[PDB]
Amino acid sequence: LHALLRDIPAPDAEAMARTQQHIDGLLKPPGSLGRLETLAVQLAGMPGLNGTPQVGEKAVLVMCADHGVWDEGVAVSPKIVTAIQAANMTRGTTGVCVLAAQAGAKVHVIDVGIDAEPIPGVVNMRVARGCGNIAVGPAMSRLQAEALLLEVSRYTCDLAQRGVTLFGVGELGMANTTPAAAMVSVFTGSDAKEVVGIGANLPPSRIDNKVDVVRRAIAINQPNPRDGIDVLSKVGGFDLVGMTGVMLGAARCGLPVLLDGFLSYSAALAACQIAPAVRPYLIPSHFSAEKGARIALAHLSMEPYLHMAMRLGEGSGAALAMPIVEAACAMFHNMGELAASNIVLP
Amino acid sequence: LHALLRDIPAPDAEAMARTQQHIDGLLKPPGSLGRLETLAVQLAGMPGLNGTPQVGEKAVLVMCADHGVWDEGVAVSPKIVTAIQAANMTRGTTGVCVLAAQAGAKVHVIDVGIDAEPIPGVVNMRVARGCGNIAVGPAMSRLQAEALLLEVSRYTCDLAQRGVTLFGVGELGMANTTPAAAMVSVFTGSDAKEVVGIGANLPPSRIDNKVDVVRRAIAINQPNPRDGIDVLSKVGGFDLVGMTGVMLGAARCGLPVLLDGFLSYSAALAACQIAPAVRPYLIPSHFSAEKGARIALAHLSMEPYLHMAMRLGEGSGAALAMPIVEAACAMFHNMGELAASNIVLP
Numbered sequence A, B: 001l002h003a004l005l006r007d008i009p010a011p012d013a014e015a016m017a018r019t020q021q022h023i024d025g026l027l028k029p030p031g032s033l034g035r036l037e038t039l040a041v042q043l044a045g046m047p048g049l050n051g052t053p054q055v056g057e058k059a060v061l062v063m064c065a066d067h068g069v070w071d072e073g074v075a076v077s078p079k080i081v082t083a084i085q086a087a088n089m090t091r092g093t094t095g096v097c098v099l100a101a102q103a104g105a106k107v108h109v110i111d112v113g114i115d116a117e118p119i120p121g122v123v124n125m126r127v128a129r130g131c132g133n134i135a136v137g138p139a140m141s142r143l144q145a146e147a148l149l150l151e152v153s154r155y156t157c158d159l160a161q162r163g164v165t166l167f168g169v170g171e172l173g174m175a176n177t178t179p180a181a182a183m184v185s186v187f188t189g190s191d192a193k194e195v196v197g198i199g200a201n202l203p204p205s206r207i208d209n210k211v212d213v214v215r216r217a218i219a220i221n222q223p224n225p226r227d228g229i230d231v232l233s234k235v236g237g238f239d240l241v242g243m244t245g246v247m248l249g250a251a252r253c254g255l256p257v258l259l260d261g262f263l264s265y266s267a268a269l270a271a272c273q274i275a276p277a278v279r280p281y282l283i284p285s286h287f288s289a290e291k292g293a294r295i296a297l298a299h300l301s302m303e304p305y306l307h308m309a310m311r312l313g314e315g316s317g318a319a320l321a322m323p324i325v326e327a328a329c330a331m332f333h334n335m336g337e338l339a340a341s342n343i344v345l346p
């Protein structure tokens, strides 16, 4: 794991320069394609991409797990929905499945800690039958966190070997917006009230209790903000840990990762805390409708492309932005050049 | 034309109710898919869609024309670029071509007034060899405007007959951000300085002159803000007129139109002024980086989905949002239902 972190590659400045120059000569006024140009150069700097913006196969990794904090009444969704939906992921009827198919991406469902019998068809990396209730203790042990990180990380890089060049990260876990808020608060030094949202339609009344639970989790565990692993293990979850693992693996493999929503931003904060080298590999998708979104995004210095008021999760936003990535590549590769049309601009 | 305007259909409230209800039973927390749900219901209300969100063939209509105001030094792009790029549109090397191909849409290049010899392969609907210099007079006659409106409108509906269900609107005309700003100012009652932008890399120095030209166009012509045709003919352009025509035709045909950037917002203001019934057919794409964008959008009460800092034009933003539209349809049609999984939410 030290190795892992040690070996994350830096972006290829040379490839990026070449990229920029090529983009500048395309059939348009310089800089006119805005963030599409910026995205393209960003991809060019990614070592697993072979010096040019390209997209091979696409995959969306969905990390599923249950949380003990559910017992604190912070979620109106029945706990069993995690297991139900996980099964549904195998049948292609879920939101992320539908959008991924639309984007030509494959969905990988991973059970990192569902509190139910194992589900056939789901990748089994289960740590436990749900994590500990962060309200009264840690979610898990540091060892457990590290091991899951390693395992997911590896799994991710392995896919790379099979032609995957673009990852999407997502989750599924009833009550997961609670640990997500706790992490955000901790990492950004924001107060709980400012980052605690409605999650999956939590009634307005119930908010206060959710805020209290978050505060308690923090007071009781005293996670160290300078230690991302410490934070994850204490007030995080298996699903949160697995998402961070995808980010770590993609980065190590020198490949791009598309973020999803709020939950994903939390995992991204942890990943960047653990290894800043991860940053350049992350690509935002949409601007989540969860209350704590703006703060979390400011801390990652990220500006999403999509404003859809989405808050479903599952990696649905990631799948939705995939076409944008492909767009930047198409632009890079298929547009004609100014010089070829004898067009000369000041 | 009175007929045309008279026959624009109202949205189908019945279809929309059915839509909403179906969306509500899908495999997700109610309202969790945000604007994707809203978009879907919006499409369901469109009469040419046959009571459900669907997308058949896609087309992007690019209206090309020159402007006399070019002579006022408001644009650094050589005037001939309009004609050059128009030809390029026929070869599939332009920005909109590349993105449309990515979206599976076909590009229709229409010459409404290029100041050059006719270009083979381009649809010929040329009014004149460039419009009048709005700085010292009207762009064209009212008759000319009406006729172009009619003709484009018809052309648009005709495509509908051939399986097209989703339109994209774009333009190509050196110096066109000038009449666009004039229109915006007029319709929104905003001062010129507030809506005049850099266009295609106009140098910061040159701005002042651009602002003056806009003011002059307005003072001299005295267009009537309550009369959209009056405004278009006076301080608009052939390209601006044609874009409005696409919007009018799509609406009459009861079909959706995806807007592009700043230029398209101007045409949309005119269209809504001329026929408010057009409104429900319009769908924003991206949030253009042109200075006057926010104001123009506020007046249309529209919030774009994409934040790409784009300012190329040509209908590039429209092509880029097409996949979003298809996403909303896929969601509507392919997701499973809560009840089927025995999932019960409060």
Ligand SMILES: Cc1ccc(O)cc1
Residues within 6 Å of the ligand: A027, A028, A029, A343, A345, B077, B081, B085, B172, B200, B312, B313, B314
């Ligand atoms: C120089 C140029 C190229 C393309 C375009 O759409 C406008 C201007």
Ligand SMILES: Cc1ccc(O)cc1
Residues within 6 Å of the ligand: A077, A081, A085, A172, A200, A312, A313, A314, B027, B028, B029, B343, B345
């Ligand atoms: C009820 C539900 C459905 C899907 C999902 O991802 C979360 C909760």
